[PDB]
Write a protein that binds this DNA or RNA. Structure first.
Ligand SMILES: [Zn+2]
Length: 66
DNA sequence: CAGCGATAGAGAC
DNA sequence: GTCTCTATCGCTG
């Protein structure tokens, strides 16, 4: 609905992180951030969310031009 | 033109 | 030396 606010802040229902380069979701339609959706889907087992970090290593980019 | 999945790399001990 | 975790890329419609 145009309010652009499901609630307001699209939040990871698994780790509450507001900072992420790509928003993922759970096969059940629940929103996830980058690592939760990528890790939970790949591992398929509960996980000490304590591995979570508010600091993300910025990587380079295989970009250039041509 | 934008978004997503899958794969691969690096670090620490 | 090995294992694990996470992010970015390329491709398509
Ligand atoms: Zn998350």
């Amino acid at each position: 609905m145009k309010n652009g606010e499901q609630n307001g802040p699209t939040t990871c229902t698994n780790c509450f992180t507001q900072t992420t380069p790509l928003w993922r979701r759970n096969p059940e339609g629940q929103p996830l951030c980058n690592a939760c959706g990528l890790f939970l889907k790949l591992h398929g087992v509960v996980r000490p969310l304590s591995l979570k970090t508010d600091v993300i290593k910025k990587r380079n980019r295989n970009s250039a031009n041509s």
